[PDB]
Design a protein around this ligand. Structure first.
Ligand code: GSH
Length: 202
């Protein structure tokens, strides 16, 4: 039984679903695969900022948003919302140490809580070194940024296409593929964990 997670690091609703990914990774016997879809492959300014989701995500999921994000990053004209570098960091963390899910959660915290520029290589290398990957992560990240990332995006978008999935977050359970009702479980990680346990029982 495999849980496929189609995500994008710059998708606010994926951050709202971060507790669901964390809860899923605690279910014994359940395999979890990450699929980055490449949502933004935008400079920060008038167009990118026009946020009203974010406070709604916080109301629904309890996920925190930091002042350095609201009043720092989203106000920084020279920041770029690029989904490719953070996705390559997730790929590299998974390739090096099987820490893809942990790296995605850390990336989202760096962006939404800390207001860091997750599209920049030094920030992603700093996050990898925080997770204890400083030996080899730089080379793995640069390697994953090229043709591995491109192939990963193409694979993810073909999966989205076959499932009729319009966007992120999207969870699909493979036993045969079944897309799950993620909106039902937003803000309910304990319900979500029990649902995945109940699927193993059935
Ligand atoms: S965060 C990027 C967008 N995600 C959603 O709109 C999800 C909606 C919530 N899950 C919900 O309504 O409960 C997105 O993917 N938009 C379409 C796109 O492909 O850009």
């Amino acid at each position: 039984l495999t849980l496929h997670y189609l995500y994008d690091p710059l998708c606010g609703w994926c951050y709202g679903a971060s507790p669901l990914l964390a809860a899923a990774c605690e279910v014994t016997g359940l395999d979890v695969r990450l699929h980055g879809g490449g949502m933004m492959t935008q400079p920060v300014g008038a167009g990118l900022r026009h946020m009203p989701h974010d406070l709604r995500i916080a109301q629904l999921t309890g996920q925190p948003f930091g002042k350095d994000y609201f009043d720092g990053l989203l106000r920084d004209t020279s920041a770029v919302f690029d989904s490719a570098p953070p996705t390559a960091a997730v790929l590299a963390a998974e390739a090096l140490d099987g820490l893809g899910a942990a790296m995605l959660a850390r990336i989202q915290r760096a962006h939404y809580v800390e207001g860091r520029r997750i599209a920049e290589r030094p920030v992603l290398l700093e996050l990898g070194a925080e997770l204890g990957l400083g030996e080899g992560f730089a080379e793995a990240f640069d390697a994953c940024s090229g043709e591995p990332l491109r192939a990963h995006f193409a694979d993810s978008r073909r999966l989205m296409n076959r499932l009729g999935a319009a966007g992120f977050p999207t969870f699909a359970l493979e036993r045969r593929l079944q897309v799950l009702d993620t909106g039902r479980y937003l803000g309910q990680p304990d319900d979500w964990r029990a649902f995945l346990e109940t699927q193993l029982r059935l």
